[PDB]
Design a protein around this ligand. Structure first.
Ligand SMILES: CO/N=C(\C(=O)N[C@@H]1C(=O)N2C(C(=O)O)=C(CSc3nc(=O)c(=O)[nH]n3C)CS[C@H]12)c1csc(N)n1
Ligand SMILES: [Cl-]
Length: 327
C-alpha cells in the first residue's frame, strides 16, 4: 500500500482537535498534517462527523496569508530586514486599516511577530493589483486541489479588474479571498520547501515531486526565521511552541461573514506552523470554527492542539530534537 496517511498521526490529530473544539465550545474544526519536504498528506481530521471540511470548506485566511505577502515583498526587493515601517492605523473611506494595538513602527520581523495588518497592507501596496492577483493565483488560491473527495471547490480569487483600492489592502491580511485549509497548508510548502510550492499527494513520494518556484531559497529561509518569532515571547503564537524545537508559525483570527456583514461576534481561529524551523519536516495546520468559550484568537484556541499534534508528530516520525529538552 502506497498511501501517505499515517494512522498514529491521524489519530493524534483527531483526538487533539476534538479536545480543543469541545473545550472552546466551538462549532467545528479541521486539521491538516503534511510532510514539509514532499507534500505527502499525513493526516486529515474533521469534527463533528461527516464531510471533509479540510477540503470542502472555504475560509478567509486572515493573517495566515501575511507570510506570503512579506515573502513576496522581500523576494522582489521592495523591502528588506532593516526597514522600519510606519504602522499607524488609518482609513480608506469608511474602511479602517488597523491592528489590535497601535504600534508606531515595526520592522518586517515585528510585522510578522505582532501580526500587523497595517504593515502588511503597506508592503502589499508596493505591488500593482494585477501582480498581486497573479501572485495569489500561483499560491493556488482559486485553483482546485483535485484531492479526489466530493464537494471540493476551487476557492475564491476575485478578478483584479474588480478590485477597489481598499480591496487590495484588505486582501493582503486575509479579507476577500477564500481557500480550504488544505490549500492553505499547501501554500506553506513554498516556505518549508525552500521557495518551491509542492502539489501535495495522498501517496508516498520516493522523492520530492517537481514543484514550482515561488520564492528564492534565501527568501524562504529568511521568512521561516521571522516566523520563529511568532512562537517566542513577544509573538502572537507562543501557545504553539514545542519543547526541543524551534517552530515557525503564523496565527489567524477571522471575523465570519454572517449574511452581509463581518460579525464581531463569531470568529474562525487558525494556527499553522512547521518544525524543525531551520530544516522543516512537518507542517501542522489547525482551524477551529466559532469558539465560544475560553477565548477566540488563533493563538489561544488553535495553538494548544497545534503544539500537541506537532510534538507528537515529530515523536512519531523519529525526528531528533534540535535543542535540549526542558520538559
Ligand atoms: C477580528 O479581526 N478580524 C480580522 C483580522 O484583522 N484578523 C487579524 C488576525 O489574523 N489576527 C490575529 C491572529 O493573528 O490570530 C490577532 C491575534 S492577537 C491575540 N492573540 C491571542 O492569542 C491572545 O490571547 N490575545 N491577542 C490580542 C488579532 S485580530 C488579527 C479578519 C481578517 S480577515 C477576516 N474575515 N477578519
Ligand atoms: Cl521539489
Amino acid at each position: 500500500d502506497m498511501l501517505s496517511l499515517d494512522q498514529r498521526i491521524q489519530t493524534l490529530a483527531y483526538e487533539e482537535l476534538n479536545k480543543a473544539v469541545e473545550y472552546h465550545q466551538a462549532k467545528a474544526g479541521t486539521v491538516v498534517v503534511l510532510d514539509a519536504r514532499t507534500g505527502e498528506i499525513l493526516a486529515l481530521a474533521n469534527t463533528p462527523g461527516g464531510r471533509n471540511r479540510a477540503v470542502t470548506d472555504m475560509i478567509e485566511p486572515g493573517a495566515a496569508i501575511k507570510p506570503f505577502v512579506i515573502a513576496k515583498a522581500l523576494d522582489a526587493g521592495k523591502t528588506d530586514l532593516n526597514e522600519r515601517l510606519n504602522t499607524q492605523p488609518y482609513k480608506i473611506g469608511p474602511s479602517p486599516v488597523r491592528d489590535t494595538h497601535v504600534y508606531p513602527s515595526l520592522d518586517v520581523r515585528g510585522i510578522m511577530q505582532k501580526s500587523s495588518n497595517v504593515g502588511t497592507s503597506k508592503l502589499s501596496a508596493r505591488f500593482g493589483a494585477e501582480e498581486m492577483y497573479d501572485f495569489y493565483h500561483e499560491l493556488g488560491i482559486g485553483v482546485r486541489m483535485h484531492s479526489g473527495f466530493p464537494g471540493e471547490t476551487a476557492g475564491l480569487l476575485r478578478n483584479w479588474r474588480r478590485w477597489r483600492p481598499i480591496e487590495q489592502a484588505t486582501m493582503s491580511f486575509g479579507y476577500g479571498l477564500q481557500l480550504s485549509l488544505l490549500q492553505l497548508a499547501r501554500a506553506y510548502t513554498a516556505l518549508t520547501h525552500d521557495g518551491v510550492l509542492l502539489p501535495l499527494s495522498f501517496e508516498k513520494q520516493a522523492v520530492a515531486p517537481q514543484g514550482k518556484r515561488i520564492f528564492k531559497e534565501s527568501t524562504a529561509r529568511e521568512v521561516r526565521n521571522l516566523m520563529v518569532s511568532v512562537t517566542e515571547p513577544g509573538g502572537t503564537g507562543t501557545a504553539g511552541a514545542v519543547d526541543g524545537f524551534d517552530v515557525g508559525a503564523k496565527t489567524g483570527t477571522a471575523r465570519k461573514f454572517v449574511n452581509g456583514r463581518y460579525a464581531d461576534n463569531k470568529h474562525v481561529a487558525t494556527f499553522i506552523g512547521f518544525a524543525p524551523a531551520k530544516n522543516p519536516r512537518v507542517i501542522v495546520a489547525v482551524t477551529i470554527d466559532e469558539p465560544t468559550a475560553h477565548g477566540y484568537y488563533g493563538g489561544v484556541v488553535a495553538g494548544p492542539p497545534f503544539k500537541k499534534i506537532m510534538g507528537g508528530s515529530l515523536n512519531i516520525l523519529g525526528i531528533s530534537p534540535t535543542k535540549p529538552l526542558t520538559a
